[PDB]
Design a protein around this ligand. Structure first.
Ligand code: ADP
Ligand code: ADP
Ligand code: ADP
Lengths: 371, 371, 371
């Protein structure tokens, strides 16, 4: 039968059926709970909203993401997320549909262990599997080599791969992503008079970040331009009107990606860790990687980030190589398409984890060679 | 069985049975007492009049409202009011009908405590409840969101509500209502040479305020008109003839609702407190409220107050949000109709306060979440 | 010559000369304007009262604080505040006296820029500087590490500092302070029959909040005590007699500091934000902070807030660390003493901003490395 693919992720869960060309269901991976008393009794005020319902009801809710940085901290909210997914978005019973789940590399083992435990016991899936998001993003691009830089909402990582073989000893993971960038935007939108403190308006700052922010090709010259001229200011109307104006922030914010020291982290930027992960690899297979830099995730949607990344990585790397960057136009959902392709394959039929073998060997089956 | 819905309020008590479409009884919430000696014995002259008979006998009585500003200051007179209500207007025994009671928010807890105690012990009701007048007014309007502005005789308040959840921290109460407007009208009718000092004549000024007063859509141009022309003066016959004529007053009086500085108050006007109450709520629910202003109470009956309220609240609000004001034609009794609706519901049946549980826990039951 | 130290703040402005041991001038940072017409001509009624004369004339004024939450919204009134300060409290000319200005962190740049512009142009100072209130409070305490929790009238913040270096990314700001607590006290003093609505009566409620309120070391047991016993009620005579009595409120009010959800705010309490700010700093330097949790500001004057703070923060923190809380008896003016010390130093001489530099580089000099 048809296999299911579920990309839990942070910020946005995206689920659908294998073999398709786009994910059928996408909605925010948030959970809401009311925070006022309620006086008009009988209106069916459910004690928990999920996904887009909470997104629409925010004004009376307190939003709580259940996956912080690739790791799950609340398993009740995550169970509710999965149940709402299956029974409202896909409207399919998991009784006969094997699912494909994803996680960031170097994650705690308990996360995937309990994920499989729950998927087998509570939802009773006939089979399942757990892949690494970067390999899925690569399979989506129809290659077999190339360093990949998946950067979503919680985590950022590099997985250098060659001919289908991934080098785990050079995986570099950075815990700076779109969420820390939204936090920095909320930090620096206060030097213009505006304030955002509620978790219902962190979503608003997130929308502003998506709409108006871009990347500076030369951060110093662009900062000087913002200082002298004023062409960069762009307006934005909050959901009650009172249009705001932001200037320097539009590129001051995602510059944190290239200099994490802005928000108090000691680590290096995106391009530096990329070049490092390359230099950790064998001296024979670095040119293929320089040629096949693959970008994915939602945070790599920034206008012009490709040119900036290329300039920085050419500044760092030698000058006699050819530095390419694969930034497809639909890169955001590349992980889901890669998962769908990996599922719809014919060689994959012995990679699943059947419920028989799960009951026979427990939740430690994923760390076993049946990955 | 059928439940009673008693909306005490100031100025006019309105009682009746649940499930109906209008209150069965409405009469002035006054208590009269004779103030002369009487010489024709054998009449059986009562020792205290109440309600409509007091209104009819004013010329020999001294009228005394027992609820001043949402709070009850005389409990003997309010006991008499409730007794006369039940045994003469509705002619029903409270021994077999649970009743519903209302009050303005931010009232002293003693008021509702003693209301509950008296309704339980003295009248021996089988059950009861105490609702907030604004939420009942919203019930009658057939919504589940929308800031409401109830304006009765002694109290005026705003309760912003969203999906049945009301925000208690953005409630704004004002102690300027129809009674202070009657006092102002009595004050300014003394420049036209007319005098009113008695409590039997405050009723006359009240009838004048109801029949002739209106709201100035543009106060400055309307004052200029009242200076230049004379087209506005509408006559009025006092109960002994001697027709009076009033000019500027017809709109000079209810402007106090928009500028309390006329009578020495420091708080803002109706529209500014509404806008403030809106600005205290979350930034994501403001547009629904702007769209769903609800009005109630008798003081929102002034001809033209809706257009004036809309103009002011638009001048204060942003220029992109659409501002509505839901002023039904029967808005005056929205509180009672909403109370009847709340009573005749099916989920409301376990929300009462039983005499058993009351005798078990005392009058402090209402402060308990059994509200 | 001697350097001037001016601490604007909300609630109380405190100015004086460097090197002293107490501020020479403290008066309420209010501005009062008359609100009645006046009939006795020739009495020389000025057109705007300022400071303590406004406090003494309140009964005929409308008070208007010009600094709401660390930010200034009326610059005319603040200009008048500074003028009155220099020419009546200190009676000194700013023509040769460099001054020291303070502000809460994460403030809009416009407030500071215009403060600098006005101090240079209008008052014509020879030099000036703008420091952060928390670092001043720290310098007053003779340390160089330890996080500080300054909590005045309009703003509350945390600044983790280590060996003179302050971590900017772990600063936590909260917009809940003494003013919101006075608002809550005015909110809950209405469930006892008393009403306070005028802006001249907010001062009275403020004095009540200062004299009678305290913190409950165990809120639930204290609420139970207030329910059962009555030993807690303390009387208070309003300026015309009619002594009031308050019970539960005495500790119900400053509990908002530990649960902002009481007044509709979503952020966490004092102790939670403190612990978060600690968990945001490096792992190797948390013990010094736990050991040196400095307090300051006027809102930390509440009787017993230290024991409650320590109990809560130990409940949140690990159990093997020593959790001290430095709370000097004179912390209320620690910011001004710290400013006086900073000025009285010998290394601070090249940190000012001379009028030459300002006329050469404009008001944007404060954002420049000459801070
Ligand atoms: N056009 C855009 N510009 C900038 N940021 C974006 C854009 N689109 C999405 N994002 C960011 O990407 C994040 C979503 O991450 P996502 O790719 O869903 O993670 P995952 O792939 O692990 O589910 C959001 O938090 C959002 O801030
Ligand atoms: N058509 C009208 N025009 C002006 N004022 C009115 C009108 N109808 C009622 N009022 C005023 O409304 C008041 C009655 O308030 P009401 O709505 O009965 O308060 P509650 O509902 O709390 O009892 C009266 O004092 C009267 O002055
Ligand atoms: N003993 C006290 N008890 C309770 N509150 C106090 C006490 N002393 C001062 N306050 C509060 O502190 C506030 C003054 O804050 P302050 O420290 O002057 O701020 P700033 O230093 O920024 O001017 C006042 O509003 C008052 O309510």
């Amino acid at each position: 039968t048809t296999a299911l693919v579920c990309d839990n992720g942070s910020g946005l869960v995206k689920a659908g059926f294998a073999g398709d060309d786009a994910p059928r269901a996408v909605f925010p991976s948030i959970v809401g709970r009311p925070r006022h008393q309620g006086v008009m009794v009988g209106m069916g005020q459910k004690d928990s909203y999920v996904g887009d319902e909470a997104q629409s009801k925010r004004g009376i809710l307190t939003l709580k993401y259940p996956i912080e940085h690739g790791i799950i901290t609340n398993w009740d909210d995550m169970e509710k997320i999965w149940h709402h997914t299956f029974y409202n978005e896909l409207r399919v019973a998991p009784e006969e549909h094997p699912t494909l789940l994803t996680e960031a590399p170097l994650n705690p083992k308990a996360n995937r262990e309990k994920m499989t435990q729950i998927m087998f016991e509570t939802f009773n899936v006939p089979a399942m599997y757990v892949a690494i998001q970067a390999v899925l993003s690569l399979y989506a691009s129809g290659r077999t080599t190339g360093i990949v830089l998946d950067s979503g909402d919680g985590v950022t990582h590099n997985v250098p791969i060659y001919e289908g073989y991934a080098l785990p000893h050079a995986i570099m993971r950075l815990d700076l992503a779109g969420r820390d960038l939204t936090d920095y935007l909320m930090k620096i939108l206060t030097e213009r008079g505006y304030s955002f403190v509620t978790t219902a308006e962190r979503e608003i700052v997130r929308d502003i970040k998506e709409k108006l922010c871009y990347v500076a090709l030369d951060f110093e010259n662009e900062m000087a331009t913002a200082a002298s001229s004023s062409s960069l200011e762009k307006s934005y109307e909050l959901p009650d009107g009172q249009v705001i104006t932001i200037g320097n922030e539009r590129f001051r914010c995602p510059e944190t990606l290239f200099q994490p020291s802005f928000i108090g982290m000691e680590s290096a930027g995106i391009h530096e860790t990329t070049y490092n992960s390359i230099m950790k690899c064998d001296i024979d297979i670095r040119k293929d990687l320089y040629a096949n830099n693959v970008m994915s995730g939602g945070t790599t949607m920034y206008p012009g980030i490709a040119d900036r990344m290329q300039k920085e990585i050419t500044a760092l790397a030698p000058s006699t190589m050819k530095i390419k960057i694969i930034a497809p136009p639909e890169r955001k959902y590349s992980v889901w398409i890669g998962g769908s392709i990996l599922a719809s394959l014919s060689t994959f039929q012995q990679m699943w984890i059947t419920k028989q073998e799960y009951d026979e060997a427990g939740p430690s089956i994923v760390h076993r060679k049946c990955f």
